[PDB]
Write a protein that binds this ligand. Sequence first.
Ligand code: HEM
Ligand code: HEM
Ligand SMILES: CNc1cc(C)cc(CCc2cc(C#N)cc(CCc3cc(C)cc(N)n3)c2)n1
Ligand SMILES: CNc1cc(C)cc(CCc2cc(C#N)cc(CCc3cc(C)cc(N)n3)c2)n1
Ligand SMILES: [Cl-]
Ligand SMILES: [Cl-]
Lengths: 362, 362
Amino acid sequence: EEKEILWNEAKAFIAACYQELGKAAEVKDRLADIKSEIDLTGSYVHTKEELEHGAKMAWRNSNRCIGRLFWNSLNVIDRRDVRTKEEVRDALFHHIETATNNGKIRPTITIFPPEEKGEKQVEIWNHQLIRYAGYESDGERIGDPASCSLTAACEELGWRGERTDFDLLPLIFRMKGDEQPVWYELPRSLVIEVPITHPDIEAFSDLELKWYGVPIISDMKLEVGGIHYNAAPFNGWYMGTEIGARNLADEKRYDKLKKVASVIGIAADYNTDLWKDQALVELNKAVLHSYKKQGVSIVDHHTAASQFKRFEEQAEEAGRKLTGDWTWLIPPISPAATHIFHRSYDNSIVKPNYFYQDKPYE
Amino acid sequence: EEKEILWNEAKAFIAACYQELGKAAEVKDRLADIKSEIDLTGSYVHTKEELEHGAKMAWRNSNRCIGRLFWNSLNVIDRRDVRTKEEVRDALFHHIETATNNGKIRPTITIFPPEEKGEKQVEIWNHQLIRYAGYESDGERIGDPASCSLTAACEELGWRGERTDFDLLPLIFRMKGDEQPVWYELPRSLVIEVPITHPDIEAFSDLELKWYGVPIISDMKLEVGGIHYNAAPFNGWYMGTEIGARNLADEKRYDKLKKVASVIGIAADYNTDLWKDQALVELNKAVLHSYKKQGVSIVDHHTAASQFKRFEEQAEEAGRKLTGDWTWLIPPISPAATHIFHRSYDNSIVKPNYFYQDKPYE
Ligand code: HEM
Ligand code: HEM
Ligand SMILES: CNc1cc(C)cc(CCc2cc(C#N)cc(CCc3cc(C)cc(N)n3)c2)n1
Ligand SMILES: CNc1cc(C)cc(CCc2cc(C#N)cc(CCc3cc(C)cc(N)n3)c2)n1
Ligand SMILES: [Cl-]
Ligand SMILES: [Cl-]
């Protein structure tokens, strides 16, 4: 029942939000205003304060995120005013610039107009605002396989990649009323990249690996008080294992472990040599070293787990239930060296939150 | 309802067991016999064939075990005939000898008389038949902290440990009718141990680490067709990470990572150096090397995961549902390098199975 689920979600959110903001006295009148507004318009508009706090709560409730200690310092940019594709493009360029902050990454979310009756106003096709293209033509793989379908969709639309292993995908999004998305090439001056080198092993540079500085997830829906912000890209800084144990290591991604084993001078022939484990450690050491040397924000998984322990402690002190997904919170290397591995977490979904949504292509 | 839950479990087990054994025709008459036997005695006795297959099914259903490919080759020793503490002691000594098999470890279970009306006939106090004692007297910790409470219980009973870091705990068990357990020192000729050395790093021997060859879990209950075998110790061979990433690495166990870091020549000062990860890899390489050199069975986590993949495939081919606990099946180092990490598992409990039971001390 559309309006009823909206009103119910609104009631719960407004009470909780205003409680946290010390505004519990204003809850009654605000709810009155909202109920009338829904009665007449079928929806309601968040105040700037509600929107900001809602986006922060949504991060705080993200069960899969180890980085939640810093939820309250999220930089929230309200772009509910955009109406044109140039305004969207410029807002996304601005997000990249302000989030990057010359390498001292600022966790940031830009919030675009929400869905009206399930009707999107802006529909972003990118998984992240900055990501590498992927290709496969008869056997040979180039670039990031995770981007293969989006890359093909872009090329259908007249974009053409250089077919290096690190082509930047264009921004691609569709406006309400348009049949086709538009795409815009990323200005390279906006995009920080870090070449991967090793602190002790000079030959590591032979692999010619690099990665981009800022992960800006752009395909999830932010839900706050029953309002669906389907277009609301957000970023943090990387935890090193995301690059070194996933993006560059996974067989279905860049698949670099055999090449790493070769440059660090170990055989990749016997499981019992633990060469994959050894290669993973050195690649992950290289990633952290390289970001630190360049002055680009990054966190290692041990430090991240320690920060998360403080998030747990803060939640208990504030009297808030803690929720988490153990399977995503443990790091993909040395998980048992973190406190996370040795406890359990309630995987209940609490709103506001960020949610998956269907891809508009494929 | 005691008898009814027994009869129901018996019906399900006998049908399934006889189906798998190609004996489905005999199900009807066997069930008749069983129902009469329960009617008169309050319980029933498994045939040797039922007991053997039941113990194998129980391993096959153990959601937390990565080693299940080899479920059908379990060596089942029927000791339902024991009545004296000397017979129990001798059976446990025999299990150690036959399971060890001069280093070519045989997965084995010895099954003692089952509970009658919840009344245990034999109650084993050990967690494993072979394990090291642990102590703490005013600040200083010696040996395995996981054994502290059992060690104290043994010493209450007149045992005294030498207070090395590797004292073998005695076998300790209680017979029905006795108020106190009895204990027996392990003959050292029965116990294989492996000194830990590193394939390339000579200084690794300075740590004076060793571990025992065979993990023989002795505190779980085997449940088959509603019969509760509370005393039924079982063993496999080790996966290397159990020793190198858990027993010797955990802060609440032997806690050796800083010492490992020192002997491999790296600083243990900065999280971003990933020294814990590097130390874990070298310690785990050392463990595998040392067992292999001595001719004691062991498996690495990559090979184990590959075997488990074949277990999954075999289950599907046989038309059996697969159950598993993802949180225990992933190895504690490089979990994302295994296929296990990238799929999900149904954690449903299926019987026959092995279950936890309350400790008789503490
Ligand atoms: C500040 C630095 C941050 C770090 C280091 C961090 C770390 C991570 C990591 C490691 C993951 C899991 C990735 C994986 O499993 O491979 C994750 C997931 C997630 N993070 Fe964070 N995060 C940060 C900031 C943020 C921010 C600012 C938000 C939103 C406002 C956010 C929301 C999420 C969400 C929604 C997921 C789950 C994504 C999914 O289901 O695919 N994080 N984070
Ligand atoms: C043949 C070699 C075997 C290997 C390599 C193996 C491997 C393992 C591993 C790695 C674990 C998890 C340990 C941890 O999380 O730290 C485990 C758990 C388990 N294994 Fe196996 N296993 C083997 C044989 C057996 C046998 C023969 C049985 C029983 C007949 C068995 C039953 C179990 C059970 C019940 C658990 C869970 C124990 C608990 O809940 O504490 N395994 N196995
Ligand atoms: C069990 N862990 C598990 C399981 C599955 C099935 C997927 C993933 C990874 C999901 C995922 C992939 C990619 C990429 N590329 C980026 C992300 C963004 C993660 C993220 C988001 C933000 C905002 C900051 C930050 N540092 N990191 C998530 N993990
Ligand atoms: C998430 N993984 C997780 C979580 C918790 C809370 C505990 C454990 C470990 C349990 C455990 C501890 C110790 C010892 N010492 C031996 C075992 C026996 C494991 C075992 C049993 C057998 C038969 C063979 C074999 N190779 N290994 C289990 N794992
Ligand atoms: Cl990423
Ligand atoms: Cl063990």
